[PDB]
């Protein structure tokens with residue numbers, strides 16, 4: 349049988365791995381998944397800088413499944429409020445069907 | 448032109464890489480993608496144990512595209528029936544548009 | 547507040563990392579995320595070959611968020627037209643909610 353859940357993705361600088369993991373757990377999520385990633389973006393806020401000739405930068409990608417949209421929004425808000433202006437970061441939400 | 452397909456995700460202990468790959472292929476999927484991952488969860492069933500002070504554990508993330516919901520459900524069922532009680536594992540389904 | 551965006555995924559041979567990154571950026575995307583991956587598929591076109599007894603092959607997974615479906619389709623088209631016949635490659639699109 350199915351249950352509709354929300355999937356929050358946070359892609360951010362690899363150096364924020366432990367800090368963002370703590371926000372997710374402190375907010376009451378049941379868990380999280382994290383993957384190593386790389387990327388480029390257009391906000392140009394990376395804490396360690398960017399060179400003139402761009403190349404892919406080191407990131408992590410979190411995926412957090414939540415039983416309510418409310419909880420996904422809360423985690424997203426906390427990460428963005430704390431880090432979005434000072435660190436490269438992008439975030440999005442969608443829905444999936446959990447078992 | 449587009450075709451609606453289903454995307455099954457399985458996130459599980461890294462030690463199940465070969466066993467789960469075999470279920471996916473034996474069920475008739477056209478392929479699979481797998482990524483290294485880490486994570487934490489709340490079922491507390493990891494086959495290799497967890498310590499009192501939790502940290503991220505080693506996982507793999509599979510993504511399997513299927514032409515029917517029926518096939519995604521079958522693969523999901525087979526993995527869950529065989530491994531969910533004895534190994535850390537979470538699974539979800541959504542739809543995407545293949546070319 | 548929310549904005550509906552499109553998410554284009556391209557999973558392809560690891561050797562195409564720089565060539566596909568250039569298409570994404572030359573098309574005007576605001577960024578991209580890329581992850582190391584492995585997989586198997588059924589088209590059997592891998593540029594470096596496949597053995598009789600299959601095993602997972604080395605890939606990369608791109609995710610590209612776009613503000614229009616039009617731009618996702620354009621990037622997808624350019625990658626497919628250039629590489630799909632000569633290199634292992636699969637691609638799909640869905641929608642997500644960006645902040």
Ligand SMILES: Nc1ncnc2c1ncn2[C@@H]1O[C@H](COP(=O)(O)OP(=O)(O)OP(=O)(O)O)[C@@H](O)[C@H]1O
Pocket residue numbers: 359360386387388389390391392393394398405407435436437438575576577578579580609610611612
């Ligand atoms: N359109 C996009 N599609 C997919 N991933 C994106 C996109 N834009 C940004 N990202 C991802 O978010 C990360 C941070 O991008 P951000 O928008 O915060 O701009 P930035 O500070 O310029 O980042 P970077 O230093 O990596 O260029 C990128 O490295 C990438 O992994």
Ligand SMILES: Nc1ncnc2c1ncn2[C@@H]1O[C@H](COP(=O)(O)OP(=O)(O)OP(=O)(O)O)[C@@H](O)[C@H]1O
Pocket residue numbers: 377378379380381382411412413414458459485486487488489490491492493497504506534535536537
């Ligand atoms: N809410 C969640 N959101 C995202 N990923 C999750 C979530 N819950 C669990 N996961 C992922 O599934 C994996 C296994 O979690 P499971 O629910 O089976 O509990 P567990 O046995 O307690 O896992 P772990 O030993 O990793 O803590 C986690 O390591 C994580 O990668």
Ligand SMILES: Nc1ncnc2c1ncn2[C@@H]1O[C@H](COP(=O)(O)OP(=O)(O)OP(=O)(O)O)[C@@H](O)[C@H]1O
Pocket residue numbers: 476477478479480481510511512513557558584585586587588589590591592596603605633634635636
């Ligand atoms: N049904 C699928 N679900 C998920 N990923 C898939 C699927 N089919 C293919 N892929 C991914 O796309 C990659 C390339 O598959 P493609 O369809 O191009 O066939 P191929 O040339 O036979 O690939 P391979 O040499 O990897 O077997 C695979 O390695 C896999 O990562």
Ligand SMILES: [Ca+2]
Pocket residue numbers: 388389390391392393398
């Ligand atoms: Ca940048």
Ligand SMILES: [Ca+2]
Pocket residue numbers: 487488489490491492497
């Ligand atoms: Ca646990």
Ligand SMILES: [Ca+2]
Pocket residue numbers: 586587588589590591596
């Ligand atoms: Ca093949």
Ligand SMILES: [Cl-]
Pocket residue numbers: 383409482581607
């Ligand atoms: Cl991923």
